[PDB]
Amino acid sequence: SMQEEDTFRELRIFLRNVTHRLAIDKRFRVFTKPVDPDEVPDYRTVIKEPMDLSSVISKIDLHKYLTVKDYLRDIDLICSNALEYNPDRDPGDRLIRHRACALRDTAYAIIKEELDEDFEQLCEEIQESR
Template structure:
């Protein structure tokens, strides 16, 4: 080992043995001073039990500047715009499917008088499109909830008793399964999770759809007529809906089912 170090290059440091005075100076403080101190008493702070302190609240998030808030809202709106485009496409594909023609428009209470007494929250595909335009869907889950409502309303109003009711029930279940299959197949799970985060963030910030998306009712457009004139109401009424609507022209549920079956039979004839 000595050959590894060279004395000429000052690689070797010689340590001489300490004398008695050097040893006394080195160990004097440890033996004479430190060892002579009395031990800590029980009344000293070191022996007292520590107070249990409550957990400190997390720090408040940094307040965003107006520019950062505007940029955040623009990014969120870009994401929700893609969601609305996708939901419109899904709704359109459901509406043009002949199997789901009965669910495309609201049920007319004049044609089916007892519908409102049975169904308290009606829903149809045209109403779904209106809610998309009004920015009322922030996630695909919100959209599917209304699809579930269309199906549950059809099952509730049409009991499983006759062929007409069974056909409507089958098509309502097919509508639900088709909508879920399209969303699950074509929508990325990460995109839906991002929409959920936007929904929660906007709920915390108290941000909702702009008020100008709501359309005011149309005024009477017939010239020379007053709003209270019943004749004007007759002039401004829309023409009768075609037989292909959700509620064919009839005076009751029985006629509604008969007309619906006739349409189905005609569609099956080549």
């Protein structure tokens, strides 16, 4: 229905706003673009599903996310990719792990404060009807 297409258009507006708030934070710069295969040719042999905040906006605009749950699976993938590629005790690996955990915690905190649970349940029920 038109009403259902309006619901998904409101979900995309919400997700673009959360994503741009994460992308402007200086802590999260390393997560804003894909890893450059030139600088890091080993990356795509270790990490089987790369993800970054520029790819997430592209996916919002392609109508890939029908629920906030499917958006948070990609935020969780950005974080888990950083934890698995950079697991060592040295300061450069510990700094990117701390930033990855902060990106995940910040996204979940904005959603807890600003997403209405009944709006998410409506999106889930339209998705399950299709």
